[PDB]
Design a binder for this molecule. Structure first.
Ligand SMILES: O=P(O)(O)OC[C@@H]1O[C@](O)(CO)[C@@H](O)[C@H](O)[C@@H]1O
Ligand SMILES: O=P(O)(O)OC[C@@H]1O[C@](O)(CO)[C@@H](O)[C@H](O)[C@@H]1O
Ligand SMILES: O=P(O)(O)OC[C@@H]1O[C@](O)(CO)[C@@H](O)[C@H](O)[C@@H]1O
Ligand SMILES: O=P(O)(O)OC[C@@H]1O[C@](O)(CO)[C@@H](O)[C@H](O)[C@@H]1O
Ligand SMILES: [Mg+2]
Ligand SMILES: [Mg+2]
Ligand SMILES: [Mg+2]
Ligand SMILES: [Mg+2]
Ligand SMILES: [Mg+2]
Ligand SMILES: [Mg+2]
Ligand SMILES: [Mg+2]
Ligand SMILES: [Mg+2]
Ligand SMILES: [Mg+2]
Ligand SMILES: [Mg+2]
Ligand SMILES: [Mg+2]
Ligand SMILES: [Mg+2]
Lengths: 338, 338, 338, 338
């Protein structure tokens, strides 16, 4: 089992990433917001005595200079780590990062943006390809009771019984996208409510795990790697999560896949060594390791954490850190003095 | 001076309006959200022993069946009120309402929606016409120091000195509209931040009055009647507010004014008995009465109040009620049992 | 049914009483703390259009110049009230007050002090004599399941099942008094915890009604009139409360009853028209009216409300107001400007 | 400079100590409450890779089996630490502990109890003898403006100007002890307020450093080692603290010093190598090292942190951790699952 110290240091990782990204809040520059976050997250991780590999991040080493897929992070990745690192610290771990989950939200001062990461031992986090993903997220009472393969209407009926709430008081977060017109209409027809977001379905899935938030499920199609980070959260909190890769451009209806074809995408999946493109992944398959760590820090306001607030001489952050190793859910409000 | 009891009853007015509107949260129906709110606000006001006239509301008596301009509300508007009402309760008062400020926000589960009203004695609230309005809102330290007639860049410079904050840490809420491209760019060029909202500039202006919110000013062009409600808030809290009517379709660039002309609009202003179309209105001119009451209750989450939350058997509301008569700012968290 | 307006005005009654009492916080003068509270509560009640009679208060008209038993309060107690008051406002109501519950706590800066009152229609609040009272208070899950006639050990066993908590994690508030040595020891022997208070068993009983407080029951012997105010709270919140008068000086062991005898006290009870001195009163017997109102405002910090905080130019209060008529539990945080 | 990791691990040290001590909350056993705390604090510290020496603790090695003065704590105190520890981790540091500050408060369910520690590099924390100590604590605005050598009346006058508050709204915490009759009376005579506590003057001094608490100074005579822990807090937060040893039994008036004499105590001070018994120690002299760490976790409720709350399957803690090395003040709310 990995070093317990890591579950503490990641507090500072998401804090520093959030602070740096928040420096570009409402500046209208999604690139600078991402770059500051990515830079601050990496540098803080590279001060941890850990032996880490990025398995979800900014993109392939070609497509992304920093926190690329397969990048080594932590002091103990160094060739002579045996001089600086305990056996414990030498344990290999996989890391999924999203330094600024919802860069558009941070750029235009929109709620829902977070610095987020997940950690497990090697092989313990699914290395999702850069694909879309059908997601179903729901609270702990609903775990294994709802199912991604059910209709939205059936899932709401089940969720209603699980949470002991009328169906017309269930709140489903759905991403505002042309791909979701039918889904959205269905939820309405069922009698439930639809909370539309422009970006940031990770803070959405995470809200499902907590009572107090007025969020009871996430439905629809999001980005796959972000799905894995959400799954890691749910596994740690005992909430429901399932994901299924989406590869057909006719389903997702975006400009990103305007010059993509279903078959071309299928072959890309084969190249990734994915043999079952239609597979439904349980939370325990997406985050499958012995130990799961999850950390988040608010950039703009969300339902669980406030955004970063600056003041003369400093900043104030709110963070959520979850460890299956220490069995703790830890809310952290930090005043940073500059 | 009006009955002190009114400053208490309006707690229940905005609560009931918010609850009713929240029943349509995320239902995708901006009409039902408005109608429930309007209906619940009016009925709760009609149980108050007050002699009220609506001066800002849903529209003219022709254009709006409920809470129309000039509608009488309160038990003491009845012809035989002298049998039911104290002299005190017989005092004539003017009321500005927005039962669901940001109906689109409530319909699609977006932050920033509130049930809101303002009250003063007769003649004490400007009866704004259904026009656009250039608005400048800012915290109490900035009152009378910034000015609507200044450039955004000069106003930020001044605001910087007032709040003792670097300019690059000032947050200006601006409505996302084509009319604001130049304004938005200017604020960026100045070095400050722009928080874009899709609707709801009343909760924006109100956030300016409170430290803790990360909102330091509102700039740009909004709707005039909503401006008056915001001015009433600021006058009560001692925050800055100024408004100036906008009448030229080339400036506002909307489909609502696509078949409108500058001159046609100017003549409409004359018909309203407005002789100076270019007048800058101080907060004290928009809300000019001896006594000002202001009440708000969150429908969806904002920076000051949570949205309405429903649970098995009830709902929970958060409200803000301000009285220059009792000199109180009153935050109210209510659990309603059904 | 009484005027709904009263359930709003009492917010201001407990606020004003608390503020006035808080002016003597930590001044070491339990008399001034009481007198300011009593004075401020009465004056604010005398501005309500209600027809009230004090049935629990500072003492008999001889023993207490202000808020004495049988004193008339409210504008509609006046002989010519028919000129000022609606039929509704003319309804007769009984009021129980404790303007400063725990004057010693306020005098020495101790937690647990509150301004508190309860209202019902005439005959609806038991007019307890100035006697001690065995009390059992417990949360809603425990209502009618525990019983004052059971041993503390049996009641803890039952409470354990009701709240789904180990017995060694139940917290019983008990007053630190020689009369409770055996009771206290019993609770320990049972395995549970004892939270000792020096004064103020009303805020204790009220804490039992709320999850979040770490208080799960009140046991032991307190003052009877304060018991009735607590019962009114519980009936409104659906929590458990029972009371039984204690009249035997050998049981209570105080200096107040050093020159009292069991038989002399029994005869005093007869004079009050109490025929069953050993009667166990249900919550519904102590507060038996159709409508129950309950209001509290913190003077020093408690588990539900902060104490009054003063600042340059004003004060900040926190209040709890409960109405079976509007079916609302209402937490109120007020900033008062002077 | 010491390992930054230590400023994170101490979060868990005070949490574990608090949880263990809270298991005896309201059990009436000040010994078990202390022993659980002491045991849990030591064991959690002995899992940190640090090279620590206890300089303030349970007592001398003879008088106290656990966390005694001079005890080595941390993995890097081991003779072969060079095999397990970085140079950084091998740095010598001094630690002051109070695993349960106010054991009486925890035993009887009283507010004000905390698990607390302070850390600096070797020589950086004054090794106070087991003596009483005159203390003056006050907020940052008052730092170096008030003075322990002034009368309480002069200090209040100065504090009044510093905080911009009327003197009659200043709150001085003073310990309820016969030794303080004259002090207490003086503060009243000055016009200010006295908040009496039975134990726990560390949480009192710490409250002075924060606005929001209604505590503006600590005055009077407390225990010396606890004074040093408080000084460490103030130095980190920039609040005022001064201490002066009290050695004369006629001044302190306790049973602990009933068979002590002034001269006997003076000679004890000489044996400790203290040459100036009348010395006034600045905060920077009591906590004089380059780096200061301070950690606290609530056991029973205080003004900054809630006490430990238990629930079916776990506990919830609130902690405050301050580091001059990371320049952070960090509030931590942790849900522990068992
Ligand atoms: O290609 P589109 O239509 O934008 O959808 C991808 C979106 O990217 C985010 O919103 C942000 O990275 C992310 O939170 C979601 O996973 C979402 O699906
Ligand atoms: O005509 P558009 O371009 O929509 O602008 C009017 C908008 O209406 C609201 O957003 C909502 O009623 C309101 O909060 C604002 O005043 C705003 O200006
Ligand atoms: O006669 P004692 O031994 O003091 O007991 C009476 C006490 O009075 C209060 O503590 C305060 O009025 C009150 O909250 C309680 O009812 C308590 O019993
Ligand atoms: O000898 P007494 O009269 O008890 O005074 C010592 C007290 O011990 C504590 O209250 C608790 O350890 C501690 O918080 C204080 O320092 C206090 O002075
Ligand atoms: Mg990216
Ligand atoms: Mg991403
Ligand atoms: Mg996108
Ligand atoms: Mg409308
Ligand atoms: Mg409107
Ligand atoms: Mg519009
Ligand atoms: Mg009394
Ligand atoms: Mg009393
Ligand atoms: Mg007494
Ligand atoms: Mg000890
Ligand atoms: Mg101690
Ligand atoms: Mg002692």
């Amino acid at each position: 089992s990995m070093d317990n110290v890591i579950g503490l240091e990641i507090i500072e990782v998401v804090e520093q990433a959030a602070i740096a990204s928040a420096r570009w809040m409402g500046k209208g520059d999604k690139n600078m917001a991402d770059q500051a976050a990515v830079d601050a997250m990496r540098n803080r991780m590279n001060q941890i005595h850990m032996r880490g590999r990025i398995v979800i991040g900014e993109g392939e080493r070609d497509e992304a200079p920093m926190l690329y897929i397969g990048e080594e992070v932590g002091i103990c990745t160094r060739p002579d780590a045996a001089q600086y690192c305990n056996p414990e610290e030498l344990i290999e771990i996989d890391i999924a990062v999203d330094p600024c989950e919802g860069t558009n939200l941070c750029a235009y001062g929109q709620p829902g943006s977070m610095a987020v990461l997940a950690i497990s031992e090697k092989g313990g986090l699914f290395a999702a390809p850069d694909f879309y993903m059908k997601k179903l997220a729901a609270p702990p009472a609903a775990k294994g009771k709802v199912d991604i393969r059910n209709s939205a209407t059936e899932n709401l009926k089940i969720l209603s019984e699980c949470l002991d709430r009328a169906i017309d008081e269930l709140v489903v977060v759905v991403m505002k996208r042309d791909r979701h017109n039918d889904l959205i209409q269905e939820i309405r027809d069922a009698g439930a409510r639809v909370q539309l977001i422009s970006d940031g379905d990770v803070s959405a899935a995470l809200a499902c795990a907590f009572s107090g938030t007025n969020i009871h499920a996430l439905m629809g199609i999001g980005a796959a790697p972000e799905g894995v980070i959400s799954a890691a959260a749910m596994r740690a909190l005992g909430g429901h999560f399932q994901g299924q890769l989406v590869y057909d451009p006719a389903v997702v209806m975006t400009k990103e896949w305007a010059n993509r074809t279903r078959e071309g995408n299928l072959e890309e999946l084969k190249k990734a060594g994915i043999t079952d493109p239609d597979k439904v992944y349980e939370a325990e398959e997406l985050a499958s390791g012995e130990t799961v760590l999850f950390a988040a820090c608010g950039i703009t306001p969300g339902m669980l954490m406030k955004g970063v607030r600056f003041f003369k001489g400093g900043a104030r952050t709110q963070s959520l850190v979850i460890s299956t190793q220490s069995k703790t859910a830890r809310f952290v409000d930090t005043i940073h003095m500059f």
